[PDB]
Every structure is written in structure tokens, then in C-alpha cells.
User: Which sequence fits this backbone?
């Protein structure tokens, strides 16, 4: 099933839109950019803005369920993030980082405090309830245009500031709750997943989720091919799964999941 036959090192498309002068301040890191062919294109922007269709985000389709892999918001991209969530009919957001980790900003707070509402450009967001579990906080957000829908933000608490979790139980319990939430909402859009740059932690979460979904359909007997699955996601956003520890964590998580069955 989940055995590692190949080493990480064996793993090692146009990005014109992300490269444009107008978009330079919308990227957290200057050379981590979305491929044109899978980027999320934002419609309905302010007509006073010559460039309003860009956010550093890609759709990931396994090849049902799909994902948006994106970076943590910048102060000047919070409004664009909520335009994306709205437009794509996303109902579940998976945040894999703290706002600040080791004194570096990873994500600007883009949600209001519990029992508050804020307007982010044309989007109104109400935080109606938070639930704080050992590994994560769930925020029940109500999003409307200033047309309401509940967006459930699963904010993982416990990822270490260095390396990866030493056991995958927390991530598996978290993913199982995400799975059931997504499946409870008729025709929900892609699950939004983010971390600082939107490639390392984000890629790790998405690849695990893809492989566990295969086991849900085909059962605990193979075929799983983790390198093939990583290559498949990397054709849709550059560099998904950044480190060897993330790569080992993927196999550990899938093996543990098989153990539960």
C-alpha cells in the first residue's frame, strides 16, 4: 500500500500573469507564481483598476473533489481572497499556519473576531461561532456580497514552527473532519488550502487528502503511487511538497490511515 519505493530527490509551464508589473505587490514571494493554465482568474473587479483578475492561487484537480492552493493573504490581497472564495463557491478553508510564526508574518488576519462582522471590499464576513479543538479551531463564517453562505474555516493549530508533525494523528483527525464537512454541503466548490507561499504545507495536506480519497474508493489494497501523484499536482502549481520531511510525512499519514481500516 503506502510503502516508500523512491527517494524524494528523484522528484526534482508559463507564469506570465504573475510576472506582470501590475501584479508584483500581490505576490508574497517574488518567484513563487501560479501557472497561467490553472490560475484562479478573478472576475467582476473594480473597473477603475486596470488589473483586477489576479490572485496567487491555482486550482488542483486530481487525475470528485478539487482544491485551490494559495498563499496566505497580504494586507492588500485580503479583499481579493474573499472575491476568490465567493466566486469559486468554496465552503471550506484549510489554514495550515499561524498568522505569525517565529516572528515572521505568514498570513494577514482575513477573518473577524468571534461575534463580529467586517466588510472586506464588496464582501461581508460574520464570524458566528468558534470551536477550539486540540489540533485546530473551526470558525463558522457567513459570507455575503454587500448572497450568504457558510464558509467553514479549519485553522490548524499545531504544525511545528520547524519541520513536520512527528506523528500524523492530528492531521488525520483534522482531514477527516474537513472530508465530512465538505461532503455534508451539497455541490460545495473547491476546498481552499493555504500556508505562507502555498506550496510546502499546502502541497503536503492536498497530496495526503488525494491519496486517502483513493483508499476510500478502492480500499486498502493498492495501487497507490505517491511520486506519480506529486508530479500530477506539480503540473498544476510549481513545486508542491517542498521538503524531504514533508515527503516522508505523506507516506506516514497514508500508512496510518490504512491502519484505521
Assistant:
Amino acid at each position: 500500500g503506502a510503502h516508500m519505493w523512491e527517494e524524494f530527490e528523484t522528484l526534482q509551464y508559463s507564469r506570465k500573469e504573475g510576472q506582470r508589473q501590475e501584479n508584483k505587490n500581490k505576490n508574497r514571494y517574488k518567484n513563487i507564481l501560479p501557472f497561467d493554465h490553472t490560475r484562479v482568474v478573478l472576475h467582476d473587479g473594480d473597473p477603475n483598476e486596470p488589473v483586477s483578475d489576479y490572485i496567487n492561487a491555482n486550482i488542483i484537480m486530481p487525475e470528485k473533489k478539487s482544491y485551490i492552493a494559495t498563499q496566505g493573504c497580504l494586507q492588500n490581497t485580503v479583499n481579493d481572497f474573499w472575491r476568490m472564495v465567493f466566486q469559486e463557491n468554496s465552503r471550506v478553508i484549510v489554514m495550515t499556519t499561524k498568522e505569525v510564526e517565529r516572528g515572521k508574518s505568514k498570513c494577514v488576519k482575513y477573518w473577524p473576531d468571534e461575534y463580529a462582522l467586517k466588510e472586506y471590499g464588496v464582501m461581508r464576513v460574520r464570524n458566528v461561532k468558534e470551536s477550539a479543538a486540540h489540533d485546530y479551531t473551526l470558525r463558522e463564517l457567513k459570507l455575503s456580497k454587500v448572497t450568504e453562505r457558510t464558509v467553514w474555516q479549519y485553522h490548524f493549530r499545531t504544525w511545528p514552527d520547524h519541520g513536520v508533525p512527528s506523528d500524523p494523528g492530528g492531521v488525520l483527525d483534522f482531514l477527516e473532519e474537513v472530508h465530512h464537512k465538505q461532503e455534508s454541503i451539497m455541490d460545495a466548490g473547491p476546498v481552499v488550502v493555504h500556508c505562507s507561499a502555498g506550496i510546502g504545507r499546502t502541497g503536503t495536506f492536498i497530496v495526503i487528502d488525494i491519496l486517502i480519497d483513493i483508499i476510500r474508493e478502492k480500499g486498502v489494497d493498492c495501487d497507490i503511487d505517491v511520486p506519480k501523484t506529486i508530479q500530477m499536482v506539480r503540473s498544476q502549481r510549481s513545486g508542491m511538497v517542498q521538503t524531504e520531511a514533508q515527503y516522508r510525512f505523506i507516506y506516514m499519514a497514508v500508512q496510518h490511515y490504512i491502519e484505521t481500516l
Remarks:
- The beta strands are 57-60, 67-71, 92-95, 100-101, 104-105, 116-120, 123-132, 136-145, 149-156, 191-195.
- The chain has one domain: 1-261.
- The chain has five helices and ten strands.
- The first strand starts at residue 57 and ends at 60.
